[PDB]
């Protein structure tokens, strides 16, 4: 019988790869996109119809 060509009847699980569960388990090889980028965080301006002021604004 053929059985190697099977789908995922069994559930997928994870949470144990490189650097998961312990921060020292990151290898010093890191991916090209793991470079620091977009490091200045944007925020929404003051008076953006913020929730409490919006609530007031019935």
């Amino acid at each position: 019988m053929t059985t190697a060509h099977r789908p995922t009847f069994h559930p997928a699980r994870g949470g144990t790869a490189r650097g998961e569960g312990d921060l020292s388990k990151l290898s010093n090889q890191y991916s090209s996109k793991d470079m620091p980028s977009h490091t200045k965080m944007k925020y929404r301006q003051t008076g953006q119809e913020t929730e409490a002021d919006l609530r007031k604004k019935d």
Partner: peptide, 13 residues
């Protein structure tokens, strides 16, 4: 360079 191998894998807790 990095001193020790960490390609080890063991079962989850």
């Amino acid at each position: 360079p990095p001193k020790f191998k960490i390609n080890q894998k063991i079962p989850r807790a």
